[PDB]
Amino acid sequence: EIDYKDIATLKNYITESGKIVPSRITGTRAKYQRQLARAIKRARYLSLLPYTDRH
Amino acid sequence: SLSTEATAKIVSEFGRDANDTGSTEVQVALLTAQINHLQGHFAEHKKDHHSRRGLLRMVSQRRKLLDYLKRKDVARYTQLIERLGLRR
């Protein structure tokens, strides 16, 4: 909930296709995942992370 | 809701001592200033029922206070209406 500009942490939760990795296969908690998705959405709108590989 | 500016403008008028937050007069004046902060958030379209019910809730609490003040002291009610915005 605190940051969206330093992308070093956000690249740890998305693939080389830019798709979000499930909490059930990263040892991460879902109440984190729900807001890591918000940090990724913030960084997509910043144009520093990809939305979709179409594109 | 009522702003920090609009709250202080009531507490520094409807008082008789230094920072006197309880008097029944200031309780009624704050509820009447909360209706001034309601402007721009009430009466735009028929789709909202919340802010008319909020107005009616503040008005219900303002009646509960006034109905007691004009029974216990009498004169403090007929004097308050000369310095607060009521009926006209």
């Binding site: 909930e1 830019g18 709108y45 910043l46 144009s47 520093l48 990809p50 939305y51 594109h55 | -």
Partner: protein
């Protein structure tokens, strides 16, 4: 009043007209009695996808305290100007000033 970071993507060749924009961005908040805390630089940065035949954009960041009853009427300044895309005000989130 509330804190806003205000981030917007500028065309990287307009970096010499940005000081002339900052001149009237400052006037549009100091005329509203708000306060600024950075408004200098966040650098020219590479995007995750190309736009307008390029791959970089310029970032300024404002980091301000503003009256939130006019913060959307202030957003028109970036929206009429062709040098800018996807402007967003970005509220609080532990802002760069904190009443010290």
């Amino acid at each position: 009043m509330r804190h806003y970071e205000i981030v917007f993507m500028v065309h990287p060749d307009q970096s010499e007209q940005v000081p002339g924009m900052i001149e009237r961005y400052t006037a549009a908040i100091t005329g509203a009695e708000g306060k600024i805390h950075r408004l200098e630089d966040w650098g020219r940065r590479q995007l995750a996808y190309p736009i307008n035949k390029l791959h970089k954009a310029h970032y300024v960041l404002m980091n301000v305290e503003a009256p939130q009853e006019v913060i959307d009427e202030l957003e028109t300044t970036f929206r009429f100007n062709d040098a800018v895309i996807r402007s967003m005000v970005m509220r609080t989130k532990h802002a760069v000033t904190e009443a010290s």
